[PDB]
Amino acid sequence: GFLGAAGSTMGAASMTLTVQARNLLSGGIKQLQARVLAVERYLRDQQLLGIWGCSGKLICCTNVPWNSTWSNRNLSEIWDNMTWLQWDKEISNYTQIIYGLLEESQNQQEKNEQDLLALD
Amino acid sequence: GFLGAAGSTMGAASMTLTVQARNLLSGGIKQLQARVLAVERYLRDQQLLGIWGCSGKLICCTNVPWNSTWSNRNLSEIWDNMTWLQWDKEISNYTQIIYGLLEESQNQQEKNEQDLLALD
Amino acid sequence: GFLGAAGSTMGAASMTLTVQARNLLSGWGIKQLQARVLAVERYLRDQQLLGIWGCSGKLICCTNVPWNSTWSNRNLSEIWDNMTWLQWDKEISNYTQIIYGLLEESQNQQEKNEQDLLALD
Amino acid sequence: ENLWVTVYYGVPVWKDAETTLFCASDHNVWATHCCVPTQEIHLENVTEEFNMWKNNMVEQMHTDIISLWDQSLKPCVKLTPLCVTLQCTNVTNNITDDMRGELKNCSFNMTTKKQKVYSLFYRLDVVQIKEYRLINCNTSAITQACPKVSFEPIPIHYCAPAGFAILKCKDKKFNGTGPCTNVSTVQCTHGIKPVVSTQLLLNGSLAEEEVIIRSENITNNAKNILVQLNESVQINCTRPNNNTRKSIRIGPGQWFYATGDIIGDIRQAHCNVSKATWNETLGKVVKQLRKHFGNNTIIRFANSSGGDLEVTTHSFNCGGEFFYCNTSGLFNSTWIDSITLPCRIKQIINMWQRIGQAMYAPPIQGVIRCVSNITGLILTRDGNSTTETFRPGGGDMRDNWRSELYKYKVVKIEPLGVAPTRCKRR
Amino acid sequence: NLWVTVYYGVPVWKDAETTLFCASHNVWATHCCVPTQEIHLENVTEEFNMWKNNMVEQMHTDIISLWDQSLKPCVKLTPLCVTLQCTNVTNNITDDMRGELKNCSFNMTTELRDKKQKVYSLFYRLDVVQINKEYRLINCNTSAITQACPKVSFEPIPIHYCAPAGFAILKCKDKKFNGTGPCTNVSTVQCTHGIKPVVSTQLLLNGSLAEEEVIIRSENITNNAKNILVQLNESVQINCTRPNNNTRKSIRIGPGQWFYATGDIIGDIRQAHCNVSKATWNETLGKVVKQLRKHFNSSGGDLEVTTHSFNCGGEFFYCNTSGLFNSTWIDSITLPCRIKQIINMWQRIGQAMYAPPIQGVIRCVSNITGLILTRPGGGDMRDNWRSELYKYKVVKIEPLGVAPTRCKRR
Amino acid sequence: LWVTVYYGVPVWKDAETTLFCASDAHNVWATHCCVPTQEIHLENVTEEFNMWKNNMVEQMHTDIISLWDQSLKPCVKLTPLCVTLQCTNVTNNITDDMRGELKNCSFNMTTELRDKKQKVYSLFYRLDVVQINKEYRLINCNTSAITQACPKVSFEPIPIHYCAPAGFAILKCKDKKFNGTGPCTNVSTVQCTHGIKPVVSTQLLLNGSLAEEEVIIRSENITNNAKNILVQLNESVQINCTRPNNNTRKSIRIGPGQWFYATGDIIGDIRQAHCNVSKATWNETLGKVVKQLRKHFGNNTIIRFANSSGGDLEVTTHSFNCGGEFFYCNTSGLFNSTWIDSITLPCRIKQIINMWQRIGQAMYAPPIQGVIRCVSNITGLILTRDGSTTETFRPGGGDMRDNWRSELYKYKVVKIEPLGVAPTRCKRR
Ligand SMILES: *[C@@H]1O[C@H](CO)[C@@H](O[C@@H]2O[C@H](CO)[C@@H](O[C@@H]3O[C@H](CO[C@H]4O[C@H](CO)[C@@H](O)[C@H](O)[C@@H]4O)[C@@H](O)[C@H](O[C@H]4O[C@H](CO)[C@@H](O)[C@H](O)[C@@H]4O)[C@@H]3O)[C@H](O)[C@H]2NC(C)=O)[C@H](O)[C@H]1NC(C)=O
Ligand SMILES: *[C@@H]1O[C@H](CO)[C@@H](O[C@@H]2O[C@H](CO)[C@@H](O[C@@H]3O[C@H](CO[C@H]4O[C@H](CO)[C@@H](O)[C@H](O)[C@@H]4O)[C@@H](O)[C@H](O[C@H]4O[C@H](CO)[C@@H](O)[C@H](O)[C@@H]4O)[C@@H]3O)[C@H](O)[C@H]2NC(C)=O)[C@H](O)[C@H]1NC(C)=O
Ligand SMILES: *[C@@H]1O[C@H](CO)[C@@H](O[C@@H]2O[C@H](CO)[C@@H](O[C@@H]3O[C@H](CO)[C@@H](O)[C@H](O)[C@@H]3O)[C@H](O)[C@H]2NC(C)=O)[C@H](O)[C@H]1NC(C)=O
Ligand SMILES: *[C@@H]1O[C@H](CO)[C@@H](O[C@@H]2O[C@H](CO)[C@@H](O)[C@H](O)[C@H]2NC(C)=O)[C@H](O)[C@H]1NC(C)=O
Ligand SMILES: *[C@@H]1O[C@H](CO)[C@@H](O)[C@H](O)[C@H]1NC(C)=O
Ligand SMILES: *[C@@H]1O[C@H](CO)[C@@H](O)[C@H](O)[C@H]1NC(C)=O
Ligand SMILES: *[C@@H]1O[C@H](CO)[C@@H](O)[C@H](O)[C@H]1NC(C)=O
Ligand SMILES: *[C@@H]1O[C@H](CO)[C@@H](O)[C@H](O)[C@H]1NC(C)=O
Ligand SMILES: *[C@@H]1O[C@H](CO)[C@@H](O)[C@H](O)[C@H]1NC(C)=O
Ligand SMILES: *[C@@H]1O[C@H](CO)[C@@H](O)[C@H](O)[C@H]1NC(C)=O
Ligand SMILES: *[C@@H]1O[C@H](CO)[C@@H](O)[C@H](O)[C@H]1NC(C)=O
Ligand SMILES: *[C@@H]1O[C@H](CO)[C@@H](O)[C@H](O)[C@H]1NC(C)=O
Ligand SMILES: *[C@@H]1O[C@H](CO)[C@@H](O)[C@H](O)[C@H]1NC(C)=O
Ligand SMILES: *[C@@H]1O[C@H](CO)[C@@H](O)[C@H](O)[C@H]1NC(C)=O
Ligand SMILES: *[C@@H]1O[C@H](CO)[C@@H](O)[C@H](O)[C@H]1NC(C)=O
Ligand SMILES: *[C@@H]1O[C@H](CO)[C@@H](O)[C@H](O)[C@H]1NC(C)=O
Ligand SMILES: *[C@@H]1O[C@H](CO)[C@@H](O)[C@H](O)[C@H]1NC(C)=O
Ligand SMILES: *[C@@H]1O[C@H](CO)[C@@H](O)[C@H](O)[C@H]1NC(C)=O
Ligand SMILES: *[C@@H]1O[C@H](CO)[C@@H](O)[C@H](O)[C@H]1NC(C)=O
Ligand SMILES: *[C@@H]1O[C@H](CO)[C@@H](O)[C@H](O)[C@H]1NC(C)=O
Secondary structure (H helix, E strand, O other), rough: OOOOOOEEEHHHHHHHHHHHHHHOOOOHHHHHHHEEEEEEHHHHHHHHHHHHHOOOOOOEEEEEEOOOOHHHOOOOOOOOOOOOOHHHHHOOOOOHHHHHHHHHHHHHHHHHHHHHHHHO | OOOOOOEEEEHHHHHHHHHHHHHOOOOOHHHHHHHHHHHHHHHHHHHHHHOOOOOOOEEEEEEOOOOOOOOOOOOOHHOOOOEEEHHHOOOHHHHHHHHHHHHHHHHHHHHHHHOOOHOO | OOOOOOOOOOHHHHHOOOOOOOOOOOOOHHHHHHHHHHHHHHHHHHHHHHHHHHOOOOOOEEEEEEOOOOOOOOOOOHHOOOOEEHHHHHHHOOOOOHHHHHHHHHHHHHHHHHHHHHOOO | OOEEEEEEEEOOOOOEOOOEEEEEOOOOOOHHHHHHHHOEEEEEOOOOOEEEEOOOOHHHHHHHHHHHHHHHOOOOEEEOOOOEEEEEEOOOEOEEEOOOOEEEEEEEEEEOOOOEEEEEEEEHHHEEEOEEEEEOOOOOOOOEEOEEEEEEEEEEEEEOOOOEEEEEEEOOOOOOOOEEEOOEEEEEEEEEEEEEEOOOOEEOOOOOOEEEEEOOOOOOOOOOEEEEEEEEEEEEEEEEEEEOOOEEEEEOOOEEEEEEEEOOOOOOOOOEEHHHHHHHHHHHHHHHHHHHHHHEEEEEEEOOOOOOOOHOOOEEEEEEEEEEEEEOOOOOOEEOOOOEEEEEEEEEEEOOOOOOEEEEEOOOOOOEEEEOOOOOEEEHHHHOOOEEEEEEOOOOOOOHHHOOOOEEEEEEEEEEEEEEEEEEEE | OOEEEEOOOOOOEOOOOOOOOOEOHHHHHHHHOOOEEEEEOOOOOOEOOOOHHHHHHHHHHHHHHHHHHHHOOOOEOOOOOOOOEEOOOOEEEOOHHHHEEEEEEEEEOOOOOOEEEEEEEEEHHHEEEOOEEEEOOOOOOOOOOOOOOOOEEEOOOOOOEEEEOEEEEEEOOOOOOEEEEEEEOOOEOOOOOOOOOOOOOOOEEEOOOOOOOOOEEEEEEEEHHHEEEEEEEEEEEEEEEEEEOOOEEEEEEEEOOOEEEEEOOOOOOOOOOEEEEHHHHHHHHHHHHHHOOOOOOOOOOOOHHOOOEEEEEEEEEOOOHHHHOOOOOOOEEEEEEEEOOOOHHHOOOOOOEEEEOOOOOEEEEEEEEEEEOEEOOOOHHHHHHHHHHOOOOEEEEEEHHHEEOOOOOO | EEEEEEOOOEEEEOOOOOOEEEEOEEHHHHHHHOOOOOOOOOOOOEEEEEHHHHHHHHHHHHHHHHHHHHOOOOOEEEEHHOOEEEEEEEOEOOOOOOEEEEEEEEEEOOOOOOOOOOOEEEEEHHHHHHEOOEEEEEEEOOEEEEEOOOOEEEOOOOOOEEEEOOOEEEEEOOOOOOEEEEEEEEEEEEOOOOOOOOOOOOOOOOOOOOOOOOOEEEEOOOOOOOOOOOEEEEEEEEEEEEEEEEEEEEEEEEEEEEEEEOOOOOOEOOOOOOEEEEEEHHHHHHHHHHHHHHHHHHHEEEEOOOOOOOOOOOOOEEEEOOOOOEEEEEEOOOOOOEOOOOEEEEEEEEEEHHHHHHHOOOEOOOOOOOOEEEEEEEEEEEEEEEEOOOOEEOOOOOOOOHHHHOOOOEEEEEOOOOEEEEEEEEOOO
């Protein structure tokens, strides 16, 4: 069920990503406004994943290294013994930094792809 | 040439997917409702292809095997014989079964890729 | 720095495309819904075109459709280094639909070819 | 053995659907509404099932027409100062005796300082409670239609929203229901004039090969029969009197338009239908009715029954004027140079059988003449042995639109689907 | 050797204020056109605050808005702002009804602008004010009076509030939850369950009962500016009636414009009243007091706050509760009631409604499921809805997040 | 070479869209512009601007008319007020300039009960009444309904900002000498316009932007005498306006929740309303305007300034609204010179206002209690030119679009179209 994994640890809750994604787009003027806004939220999250090179994926790996100053916590203290609700507080002030780094890395990677396809 | 292939067999009709796809998004309160609905329907289908790991493709192959119970037919009795309208009726009662299997398969595939990248 | 590169040549302005992309969704009664619905529709139509041409998820997409000297009889050294994108857009404004049609045709054939090879070569 | 699910997007399939269609077209009410400007694909091997009696496009059109009518009358003069006692006498000034008693010269006290004013009214709009009152002053407010607003029908087209398509039946014999084997996809309808009428359908489409009789459950007497003719019958209608208008000020920038004096002699409104054309047309209808009722069954046409003027007569809007014509001169024969139909004129109009609203139709200056095409008939069966009596009738406006929107069906496109193939590993 | 890994579909949320929609000739049945799932969340602790809850504010706004849309397309009774000629109602009237009803005659308009008619009707004392035997309706001073359309039902039916996509409603299931602080028994729901929009003062009717004990709740206990909402453990059944067998007359005042006037009473004339069992009420207060001790007659304002405002059968009652709250802690009780036809709802002053008369005799039985105390009080309305929505909060779902993993792209 | 597809390309097209209003967080604009409120230089962009065809002006004009009408729509009508008035002169401690300006009118008006009437009185300005057959009726009673403006509603202009919707951008011209139309070689992109105060006036434009280097003369066609000249000053001229009479407000019940706000008695002496313009400042200001006009009309041309001629006191006067009161001031004391301590302009006051040259509507402006003082900045002028060595200029006005063109001239709306192709050497494989 939706949010069923909310109290589970991060490494367990990561297995219900389809459940959560599946119900985000689909669960007088104000009803119309509610629908338009739900679409806008959906698209902003999808655009952002596309910019980072994660279009079409629920789990994606990038080339931005984890900077330990963002969390100062090791493995098995994050993917276990912790839930996503808590993790979302542990790094709440580094979100914009990470997002900017993700956008920069993807732009550099696309340029490198374009050159390899011309050079080879 | 929208729906020009509607009476043709599946084998021919699969070659006109672009004409159908490009005409689905475009072409007082009721006008806005009509526009919002066109967008919501478009996005629901795109989300579903994405959750199944087919984002960006008009034709995608998956790893869910076909069950002889869903349709007890040879390929030559389908692709070179039936139209898509006929096919849609013949297997309509298995729609949710197949969709559920497609979501499970993609979730497992993403996890396996993540583990391989971490391992390599 | 939205449109900061406008006026710069294509070889410089082609970089930093994230800036003009990430600012396309991030914006009375009926009139404001119309403004919002339109922004969504315009966004989706451009994404739909990138998808149908096989460029989904990319800001820079290489294709397999040859460039015709008819569309623009110019060298790369006088396009990427001398022209701005505003100038280029005018230079080939009458070939846009031709190119887009060719891109759709190419992608359709490519998907069929991939399906045939996935099915045991 | 080695088959896998393959997912396809852009699959050419559909489902029956009910959606909102928008209007499009080439100071008219429909011209300003159907502001969107205005393409057929034959489907080679598609058989589809149509049903004109359960077609949602008909209900959508009915609703849109009512809405536009009511909306165009909102920003107009509300004639409440006229619900006063009138003292009326008969107009005898150069009347040709067909019109005797039809027109009255009404004097009344306008309370907007009070003033004494005069106007002419048609008999049908005045209640003899001298001491007269206008019809509907006890039931509803009467709104004067704005003189600048034109209610002349223009072709309009209904168009599908994105994600939907309209399927059109091209069979020549299509009987209104069942499978059709000549189906094409269109973006919009052919252009329908929203003509309002009773008994006779004016300015519609003609059948291409023969008269087609369409009805739901035809053996059921309590059903209307829509007869589509293959040739039109031209009907010439006129309001011969030369009218003028009298503008009565009833407020700070508001005027009531009253019928003024008639210039010249006063004669009755009428419609002319050629005898030969009508006789051949009616004979064709009989030839086709016998296919359902028997080759040796006698067919008799009789005129309308009792009921409201709006359904017992042939109602139509001609030049903006409202006519109520007597069709007993047409539907009167037994089957085994011109016909003149007397007409009445009425100014206070209650449309679509509603009684909580009323419109005052301003008088129209000059003389009115219309040339219209009879394209179809609406008949009913009279409740027998070997004689089948048919009468003109039916006041439900939906049936005037079913007659054009019978070839169209709305379907929802469902582009996503799956099928077995031999590929694996994406 | 850790890398940023991006996840979508992460089950997290933030508090949020969004618009909820309603789901099910009644006004709410017509409005709540949407037809009508609970997921337990193990190990989720959440913070709730019933006193800071946008759901209550939206319900209040929706009720006012719906009410106004309902009255908008109805007869506007401005022809009645005339001097009325009024005498007392006599004949088979009891001692308790003397001066309660007045028989008013007046000069009214008709369907024609040049005609007038003389009509008469009965009014309750509360609706008619002197201005000799010359009276006017109480609101022919500050506003127009709109007649409610007789076909319209304002009967409360249960309605459900439902979240839009991207949002969820979290429900607190803890027993003995006092409207604030952490809740450890939490579940996600699609909608708020059936909440009946019952409008009343002092006594809350037809609400939810507490599972085990009477629950005392307030924004700031020991303040004096705040009301105490008491949720009862058991219901108290209250039997109300307007015993007089009445009739109606329809008067045409314009072109299809009808006014519904109170006609002669055709039976005997008696006072309206409400009954409760005496022991049930005494036990109920004893339970409330027991709980008040764990923490340690109405007066002031108009009838709308000093009496028990109550809608029964569609009629508007103003009942005297001094018979219920007259005891110091350390077979039945009868409450006299007044009836009023001109109603000014929600402390608004620019609007007024005329409540059409009801034929025959009215009887109803209601459940007292809670009290508003301060000594009875209330009249705030938002506080009535807080008694059903105290267990719900709306949260925004936030699907993206990042975390360190050992997975590198390529 | 191969076709390469690029998304996020920095290009645009001219476009017309609906802009939304934002503001700096019972005023009409404050209520409407509910969205609360940077600049990017575009090096080497040389875009073409055209003030006279700028769609942003039409949008602003429409928004002003619409809000004004929606604001008045729900307010009490004064239909029951137009009855024959019985009027006499106000003669108590009145100066000479004011004799005949004010009248004391009594009349029979309705009450909250249908069967009752009351006798009331009020004061009116001469310009608001029509003598009949002493007996008077209000101006416009027989042509339009007069709607009373709600006394709680403020029409005070506040700065407002126009902002582009997503997918659009506003380009701003920074050329200090830009004359409305033509190429601009110094262009930047903004999200919102600067704060523009929707001030309504004729002849003299108050509280706008100043030119930065010199007085700028702008015209669609400087040689076409049928077109107006918009003059933007490089310094402001301060103008001090007042209505010195200490007035009162008399509330009259006219119906059940319906009130009329009548002008009550005046406390103290009665004097004429007026505006003061510094004399030396005005003289220098025109000298600068003249130098810039010579650049278009000849350096040996005689330039004359003269006052207005035809038209009603809507256009022949300097109309403005401050303190909630409507003033119609005489500017002939300013536009009176030939080019080779203070100026006092007398003012008229009106309560029945016909906005935006419409004739079927009218507004009644409730009286303002006490005394009104306004200090405004003259930031620009509207001049017209007479149709062979002498040119004559006169004050213009009436068409509000020209006031809004004085602020919305630097801005252009464009649509962003971030998708295109170009040849490259890469091939997809
Ligand atoms: C079935 O379809 C037919 C048409 O195929 C309809 O018949 C037409 O109906 C319209 C409206 O009733 C008639 O229009 C009127 O024609 C008058 C005659 O003018 C003729 O001569 C002038 C000479 O200069 C020509 O310019 C003109 O085109 C005509 O040939 C006009 O005088 C009328 O003008 C008045 O009304 C218009 C309305 O917009 C105003 O703008 C004018 O100022 C003025 O007040 C008007 O134009 C038309 O003539 C009819 N055609 C025929 C053949 O008779 C049927 O009515 C329709 N059936 C039904 C039931 O709707
Ligand atoms: C707390 O909750 C209780 C219910 O648990 C509410 O009390 C009920 O309130 C409703 C509405 O006021 C009452 O419904 C009315 O009952 C009248 C009598 O019913 C008898 O006749 C019907 C005939 O069909 C039988 O089915 C029924 O069993 C009885 O024998 C009806 O006459 C009323 O009808 C009205 O509408 C129709 C519409 O066509 C008109 O024709 C009628 O003239 C009339 O106007 C209506 O149905 C219900 O009876 C009450 N229950 C009890 C136990 O009394 C409380 O009101 C609620 N508390 C609060 C504060 O709201
Ligand atoms: C041009 O801008 C100036 C301000 O720079 C405007 O003048 C100001 O107008 C307001 C509203 O009339 C005055 O405020 C009022 O003060 C009284 C004091 O008793 C108060 O009761 C009112 O509620 C209100 O707050 C303000 O004082 C005044 N400024 C000055 C210097 O006097 C001017 O109106 C603008 N010009 C035009 C034509 O709009
Ligand atoms: C509005 O119309 C009325 C008439 O309906 C005008 O009043 C008349 O004016 C003439 C000439 O001054 C007098 O001889 C009449 O006796 C007046 N009639 C009444 C009933 O008094 C009125 O003047 C018009 N309004 C305006 C502003 O002029
Ligand atoms: C809740 O915590 C317990 C341990 O206290 C654990 O066994 C259980 O699996 C957790 N529930 C969920 C949904 O993860
Ligand atoms: C974010 O900043 C606030 C500043 O008050 C601080 O309290 C909070 O702990 C910080 N969060 C993180 C993740 O460091
Ligand atoms: C229609 O069916 C016939 C066989 O009956 C076939 O030959 C023809 O190619 C089909 N047409 C299309 C467009 O598929
Ligand atoms: C689906 O099930 C229904 C019975 O519930 C049956 O009538 C129908 O034929 C079935 N359709 C298919 C494709 O098997
Ligand atoms: C495209 O390139 C080929 C190269 O042989 C040329 O023949 C063709 O004419 C070009 N297309 C157009 C429209 O000129
Ligand atoms: C309609 O169907 C008939 C066969 O019944 C065929 O001969 C005719 O050509 C078809 N017409 C169209 C328009 O397809
Ligand atoms: C014609 O329509 C009637 C409608 O009741 C139907 O019963 C009949 O079968 C139809 N005829 C044909 C040939 O389909
Ligand atoms: C057709 O009409 C007959 C009566 O003439 C009736 O018995 C039958 O049920 C009707 N059929 C349908 C499909 O309604
Ligand atoms: C109707 O009028 C036309 C000319 O407009 C004429 O040719 C025709 O014969 C007339 N028809 C009748 C029945 O009079
Ligand atoms: C009649 O009404 C007056 C005023 O309400 C009251 O004082 C008097 O007692 C009443 N008389 C009767 C018989 O009720
Ligand atoms: C109605 O008006 C007449 C006017 O003479 C008055 O005598 C009578 O008393 C009034 N009637 C009522 C009930 O107000
Ligand atoms: C209240 O109790 C009295 C007896 O004291 C009884 O006559 C009356 O009918 C009861 N009222 C109700 C509403 O049951
Ligand atoms: C009660 O009211 C009904 C209403 O129809 C009436 O018929 C009946 O006689 C009344 N009974 C009385 C006054 O006892
Ligand atoms: C309320 O009515 C019910 C009907 O069964 C009755 O049992 C109960 O005693 C009544 N309550 C009171 C307080 O009279
Ligand atoms: C009243 O005003 C008129 C305006 O022309 C003036 O002539 C007249 O003398 C004034 N009367 C008094 C008493 O001042
Ligand atoms: C009010 O009406 C009376 C009617 O006799 C008249 O004498 C009086 O002069 C009127 N008053 C005013 C101020 O018009």
